[PDB]
Design a protein around this ligand. Structure first.
Ligand SMILES: Nc1ncnc2c1ncn2[C@@H]1O[C@H](COP(=O)(O)OP(=O)(O)OP(=O)(O)O)[C@@H](O)[C@H]1O
Ligand SMILES: [Mg+2]
Lengths: 100, 50, 50, 50
């Protein structure tokens, strides 16, 4: 409110499982009035889910973040990546670099 | 005639974009692919991907 | 989700067949073998299923 | 004469090339690719790649 126009940020809750890290996300989303959305990252290997496709393939669709833009009409939704701590990284070539 | 299945697509997508404050960068790309979609045969795979 | 009725043989997706064959609007559909869904060309259809 | 043609697509590239000074080496490759580009029927996937 003091610095004019609305702005983004990043955060990282952490604590023992089942303590309510997730519910507060939905509550904060209701409090700030911006739209909510979430998606798991745990155990994924290929980057396409965060990154869509080249669309010369016969079956390509844009990556999930673009779907969330298609549903969440707002250009500043409260995305909630979750359970990064067990991010899938066993494949050759980290998807986590694309995440960064 | 409701048989038009070419310029109907053009007007629909052009109308859907008006409300947004479109960056000029994307505006050029969407305009070009509209020009390409508006000349193509209705049933080619190119028309469906576009 | 089904096809766009432009492609050959574009029959409606499976839910519509169940709605026809059961001839009533309240079937007890029963998904099976959910465990090994995913990792398609689209990543997975699970979002739409959800 | 009026109305659109493929040579207009051939042209907008050429004009983009008209200002910057290309090395003689690549001055050819673009030449043969352009000369090939006109002869294709436009719906062939080869036209997309070229
Ligand atoms: N402080 C709290 N007040 C009320 N309910 C709570 C609280 N913390 C947790 N809960 C209950 O726990 C359930 C799930 O909580 P939550 O998913 O946040 O656990 P978690 O720590 O996120 O688990 P994980 O992080 O492993 O997904 C919710 O239904 C919620 O009602
Ligand atoms: Mg939880």
């Amino acid at each position: 409110q003091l610095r004019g126009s609305t702005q983004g940020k990043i955060l990282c809750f952490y604590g023992p499982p089942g303590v309510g890290k997730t519910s507060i996300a939905r509550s904060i989303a209701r409090a700030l009035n911006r739209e909510y959305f979430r998606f798991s990252v745990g155990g994924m290997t290929d980057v396409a889910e965060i990154k869509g496709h080249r669309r010369t393939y016969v079956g390509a669709m844009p990556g999930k973040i673009i779907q969330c833009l298609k549903k969440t009409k707002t250009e500043n939704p409260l995305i909630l990546i979750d359970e990064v701590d067990k991010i899938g990284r066993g494949y050759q070539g980290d998807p986590s670099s694309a995440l960064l | 005639l409701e048989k038009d299945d070419k310029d109907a697509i053009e007007e629909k997508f052009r109308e859907r974009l008006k409300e947004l404050v479109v960056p000029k960068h994307v505006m050029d790309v969407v305009d070009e692919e509209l020009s390409k979609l508006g000349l193509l045969d209705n049933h080619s795979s190119e028309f469906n991907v576009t």
